[PDB]
Amino acid sequence: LAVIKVVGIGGGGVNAVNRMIEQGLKGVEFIAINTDAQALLMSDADVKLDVGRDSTRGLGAGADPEVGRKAAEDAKDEIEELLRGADMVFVTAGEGGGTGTGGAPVVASIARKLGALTVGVVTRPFSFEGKRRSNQAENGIAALRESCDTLIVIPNDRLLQMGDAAVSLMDAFRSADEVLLNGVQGITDLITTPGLINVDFADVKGIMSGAGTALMGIGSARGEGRSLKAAEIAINSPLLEASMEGAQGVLMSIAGGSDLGLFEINEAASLVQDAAHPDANIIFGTVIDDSLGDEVRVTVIAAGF
């Protein structure tokens, strides 16, 4: 039984972790790291960690990656203790800010030296947030990639092509929350709550260790030929580029109720096998989830380029 910790660092990461908690992501410990005491108050994470300066006083708002990086190393001993003896560590953040952008590569480096399989799950900022954030996020991703075994990057721009035409500025970030959850849960659920086609940690570790940069796709469908449709949506998801075939490795999960048909599972499995490069390592499994009813959702992670 695996020890999996999910770290949400910076404002966005903490909000993402709250969505995960709110949605009932199980079998994982949630850690919230921030510089701001006030924002940490609204967090529902098991473990919270205030860092850097007091938010109750001076400059909480400034978004400097250098500030966030320094704050992290001033807490390296405390962080290491929170990640003590974990088998897997997820580092979720919204790239572009200060706390997340600079702090994340530190948290990951620590988790990796502890010997844990280190998976970063971050978002690229929306273009409407300006080039300054686009720039910072770009360096923050370069850095975090060095510290992770695998780094899944979700381009926020593509979420707007999926969400409704008339969405608020707040609905936009709720989608960002939801997709970060999708990334994490799509992987952890394979381990914590497997179905008929059982995948164990060793399989996942094999496909994700030193994988480098990675991308994800999600899909879901109902009733009539659902599993195939869901799988098809996932492999064609805009979040995943055309570069599904360019992947060295593919991790795939299909979640559904206890009554998830073997035939269904097989059709999804076959589709991904055909869609991926002939030489790619493909590991795939099923997840039991009664909260889905008669809907099934497929997650595809494509790694190694």
Ligand SMILES: Nc1nc2c(ncn2[C@@H]2O[C@H](COP(=O)(O)OP(=O)(O)O)[C@@H](O)[C@H]2O)c(=O)[nH]1
């Ligand atoms: N998932 C998610 N992402 C967010 C949210 N708010 C902002 N972001 C993204 O995260 C980036 C950094 O913001 P934030 O994490 O709040 O600043 P930081 O704490 O200094 O890292 C922004 O440029 C946004 O693209 C949110 O509520 N949820």
